[PDB]
């Protein structure tokens, strides 16, 4: 298509919201949108122009292909960090209504690394206190936590332990004594997924992921330690437990190790076969979709839930290891240090929420790949501390740029289904955070700057 | 049976020479001839008759009481009335029965009194609030007293601790603007719907705890440490309630510190 | 027969008890063992708990011998009375002093006093003369207590109500009610966390 | 081991199972629809309790020895 003939299909609603009307791609069902500021518009449009002039579709075209699947309601949404990825675009959001039997699930919508997330721990020390023993603390953290490809968890595990962890989740880690009662409180979904069946997981995944628990892995996973830099919302920071600057925090970014990838692939290979029988055709062969009320769809849902529980157990074990390391270094009990957990969000999970569309209540299964859930204040699924400020959302970046802590808003719940960005993506994290703040879908509360990072 | 009788006497409290097992055994073997035995029987039977609804330790009177108090011992009443039995075992049995019956009557009366006072407290009356204030402010119970006298008493009491503490202690009410009677119905409706929603939320929280403890109960150590788990879990768990206690009185009594 | 003793122990069928029955006697024995005597652990009582088995009397003899009861099942009524007395004695050994001493034997000025007390303690007037009295009760209990006197030595609009009733004065009351409800829910959550910690400390 | 774990958690028991236990122990039941009354009766009459600590009296001393 001609570049002007392509751009005739794009318009703007307001300053921080574009709009892709029907007709951009064949067999659309509803218009797509994305939230970008002036710097982001240039990047998106340069990408589109170069694509119209590689084997990967442009981000807008992937949004369009996503906007064609059956059962999708409201509009396809691209968060300010949207970029091209397998199947669903990275940072793309889509909610399907369970009431319509035509509704489908998508293994690519949830993501290959099922339920990778960020957990934050606060500590009552200061930067000038950690700094004298900064090297010793970094060495102790590096040696205590097994990080790297092929590393095995220090704590032992078996088949029964893995099966129980898959079935329960944070409950198993909290029963063995690895996590306090407060850790279950400050966790998304309260640490575990209700519907889950370990026997719905392929035994190959269980065999592969047995020694991988407690291991950070390679890629974007880390267990870095950082210092508070600025506070934008005094009330929100006080509620979260951070009152004055210079406080110490530790974020652990971790995934589901090998269970998530194996579950995703084993679901995809059967989902492709089931697509032929189910009579479903879409723009891209990578967009796997089968009916929600189907054996393959239910099996994938249960496998993804088990992978999420495994990832939560892994994060809880990492928290316990970090707490032990800090207690050993500072020769004080961790409870005295006040090493609690602020929150735990997951940006690679599809969950069954109850958003409201067009003034009519609907139960929606929502895919969130590369995007973090946020909820407005007084929502009945947030901890009691955050019922007045809104659910925290932690923007886990990498080494270098400073991670952020936003909070959800009332507008975002009714506009973008309570979803915000989850990092810079393959762009500027500050630009994305500013776009989210100006769009009315979040508000920043704390900015944290790293001092030490533990990678592999 | 000497140990049981000695324990009962110690629980009830006796200043006599019965604290020695040998003396008690000798007195019981002696029978009704000992003045100590008849004195003790009279001391027990006066209180037993006082406690029973139908209200000298001669065999006829105590046997009549045994018949009236539904004494279940096989042939004890008839043999006591006849006087043919002189075994010490009969003496131990009758002492044990009368003492246990007296203890049970005392327990029953105490429990009935406690239940009656709890029922009286349950009534939604100003008396409960006045009693709570007087008890927490070391003042005489206003029940049975003139209301103006008690009101003046609590009035005078409050100031003596008011100025002892700094003025910025009670604080100013958070509900500052005046509210007319018209808005109170709407306020009550808002409170009712909020209470219903938060009751639902509390019930969900309690059910989450139920699921977590069920997941706990399947542990291998959970099958060998049942005593400690029960002791440390039953009273903690069975005290939670789903009902929300917020009312308009809490709104009126709320100060500016809760609205910070 | 055994009515007073059973009632003192808070039995569910004080009148309908029969000693000569077969199954109901075992039911009462197990209730007394797990409720009013509590000698062994819960898990050990299993052999005694099994009611319809024909080997139950042997476990009954073992239980009677363990507590060192002077009698045996040859006199069922004797053991019933002895065990009832033992349970009553066990209940008695909690507070001896209080149990030993038991022995059978709209006004305008009221409203004015309540109004004066409310005015002194900064409580807004209300139509019902009992509501503000309860307000004074809560205020005095919360603030005029030994703990508070021992420990003696953000704007309202900054919070989010979550909705809008369209009023300027009812909004403040709605915000206050929401804050009170949130505080109660937080108290419940703290109790739940305490219970979970207490249970997990055993394992 | 299963029976004690079943009797110790009235919260997880079904309504029908609680009613069956209450009828088996010949316990009078009022307003059977309400769960609160059934749970109260079960806690007041059926649930077992831990072993009592040894009393200060002579019987406890004899039992300890």
């Amino acid at each position: 298509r001609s570049y002007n003939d392509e751009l005739q299909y794009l318009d703007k609603i307001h300053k921080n919201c574009w709009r892709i009307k029907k007709g951009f791609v064949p067999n659309m069902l509803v218009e797509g949108v994305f939230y970008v500021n002036d710097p982001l518009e240039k990047l998106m449009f340069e990408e589109l122009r170069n694509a119209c002039r590689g084997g990967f579709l442009p981000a807008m075209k992937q949004i369009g292909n996503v906007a064609a699947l059956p059962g999708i309601v409201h509009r396809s949404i691209g968060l300010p960090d949207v970029h091209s990825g397998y199947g669903f675009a990275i940072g793309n959001m889509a909610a399907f209504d369970m009431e319509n039997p035509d509704a489908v699930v998508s293994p690519g919508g949830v993501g290959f690394d099922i339920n990778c997330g960020v957990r934050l721990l606060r500590t009552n020390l200061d930067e000038g206190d950690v700094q004298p023993v900064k090297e010793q603390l970094a060495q102790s953290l590096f040696d205590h936590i097994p990080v790297g490809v092929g590393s095995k968890g220090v704590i032992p595990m078996g088949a029964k332990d893995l099966e129980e962890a898959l079935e329960m989740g944070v409950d198993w880690s909290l029963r063995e004594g690895y996590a306090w009662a407060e850790d279950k409180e400050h966790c998304e979904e309260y640490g575990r997924m209700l519907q889950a069946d370990p026997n719905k997981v392929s035994s190959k995944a269980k065999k592969r992921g047995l020694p991988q628990l407690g291991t950070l892995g390679a890629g974007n996973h880390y267990a870095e330690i950082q210092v508070v830099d600025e506070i934008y919302n005094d009330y929100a920071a006080k509620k979260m437990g951070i009152d004055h600057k210079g406080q110490v925090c530790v974020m652990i970014h971790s995934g589901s190790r090998g269970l998530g990838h194996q579950v995703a692939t084993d679901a995809l290979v059967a989902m492709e076969k089931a697509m032929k029988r189910d009579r479903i055709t879409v723009n891209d062969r990578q967009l796997a979709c089968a009916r929600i009320t189907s054996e393959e769809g239910q099996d994938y849902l249960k496998g993804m839930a088990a992978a999420g529980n495994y990832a939560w157990v892994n994060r809880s074990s990492m928290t316990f290891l970090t707490r032990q390391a800090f207690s050993k270094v500072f020769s004080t009990t961790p409870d005295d240090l006040d090493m609690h957990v602020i929150y735990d969000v997951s940006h690679n999970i599809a969950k069954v929420e109850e958003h409201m569309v067009d003034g009519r209540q609907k139960t929606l299964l929502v895919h969130r790949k590369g995007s973090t859930r946020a909820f407005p204040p007084h929502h009945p699924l947030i901890p009691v501390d955050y019922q007045l400020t809104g659910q925290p959302v932690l923007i886990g970046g990498t080494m270098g740029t400073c991670s952020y802590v936003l909070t959800g808003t009332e507008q975002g719940m009714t506009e973008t289904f309570g979803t915000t960005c989850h990092g810079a993506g393959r762009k500027n994290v500050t630009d994305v955070v500013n776009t989210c703040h100006d769009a009315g879908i979040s508000k920043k509360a704390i900015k944290l700057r790293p001092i030490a990072v533990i990678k592999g | 049976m000497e140990s049981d009788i000695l324990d009962i006497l110690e629980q009830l409290g006796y200043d006599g020479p019965l604290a020695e097992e040998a003396c008690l055994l000798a007195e019981c073997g002696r029978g009704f001839s000992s003045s100590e035995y008849v004195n003790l029987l009279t001391w027990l039977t006066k209180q037993l008759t006082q406690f029973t609804e139908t209200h000298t330790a001669d065999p006829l009177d105590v046997s009549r009481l045994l018949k009236d108090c539904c004494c279940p011992y096989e042939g004890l009443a008839s043999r006591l009335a006849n006087g043919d039995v002189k075994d010490t075992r009969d003496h131990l049995k009758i002492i044990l029965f009368v003492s246990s019956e007296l203890q049970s009557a005392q327990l029953l009366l105490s429990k009935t009194l406690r239940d009656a006072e709890e029922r009286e407290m349950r009534s939604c009356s100003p008396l409960q609030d006045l009693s709570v204030i007087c008890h927490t402010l070391t003042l005489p119970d206003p029940a049975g007293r003139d209301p103006t006298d008690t009101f003046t008493d609590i009035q005078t009491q409050v100031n003596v601790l008011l100025e002892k503490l700094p003025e910025t202690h009670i604080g100013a009410p958070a509900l500052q603007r005046s509210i007319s009677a018209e808005q109170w119905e709407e306020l009550e409706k808002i409170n009712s719907t909020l209470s219903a929603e938060y009751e639902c939320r509390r019930r969900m929280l309690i059910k989450r705890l139920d699921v977590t403890v069920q997941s706990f109960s399947w542990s291998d150590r959970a099958k060998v440490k049942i005593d400690q788990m029960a002791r440390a879990y039953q009273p903690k768990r069975h005290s939670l309630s789903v009902r929300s206690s917020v009312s308009l009185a809490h709104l009126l009594a709320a100060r500016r510190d809760i609205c910070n | 027969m055994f009515r007073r003793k059973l009632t003192a122990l808070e039995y569910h069928n004080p009148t309908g008890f029969d000693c000569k029955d077969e199954t109901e006697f075992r039911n009462f024995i197990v209730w007394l063992e797990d409720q009013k005597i509590r000698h062994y652990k819960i898990e050990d009582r299993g052999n005694l708990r099994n009611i319809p088995s024909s080997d139950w009397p042997k476990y009954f003899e073992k239980y009677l011998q363990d507590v060192n009861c002077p009698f045996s099942v040859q006199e069922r009524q004797e053991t019933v009375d002895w065990l009832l007395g033992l349970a009553v004695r066990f209940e008695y050994g909690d507070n001896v002093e209080k149990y030993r001493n038991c022995k059978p034997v709209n006004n305008p000025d009221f409203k004015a006093g309540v109004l004066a007390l409310a005015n002194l303690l900064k409580i807004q007037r209300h139509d019902d003369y009992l509501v503000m009295l309860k307000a004074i009760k809560i205020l005095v209990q919360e603030r005029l207590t030994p703990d508070a006197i021992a420990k003696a030595s953000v704007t309202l609009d900054k919070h989010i109500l979550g909705f809008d009733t369209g009023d300027a004065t009812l909004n403040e009351a709605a915000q206050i009610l929401r804050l009170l409800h949130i505080e109660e829910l937080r108290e419940l959550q703290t109790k739940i966390n305490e219970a979970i910690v207490a249970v997990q400390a055993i394992i | 081991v299963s029976k004690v774990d079943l009797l110790l958690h009235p919260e997880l028991l079904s309504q029908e199972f609680i009613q069956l236990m209450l009828q088996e122990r010949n316990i009078a039941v009022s307003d059977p629809e309400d769960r609160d009354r059934l749970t109260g009766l079960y806690l007041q009459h059926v649930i077992p309790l831990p072993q009592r600590e040894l009393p200060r009296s002579r019987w406890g001393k004899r039992m300890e020895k």
């Binding site: 409201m356 009945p380 | 929603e197 059910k207 139920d210 699921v211 | - | 079904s14």
Partner: peptide
Amino acid sequence: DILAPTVQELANLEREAQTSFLHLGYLP
């Protein structure tokens, strides 16, 4: 049955809480 489905009724309670929250302050 000797046991009751607790996870399913927990999910039902969560859904009911979400419905109440939406109906309170998101009703058009």
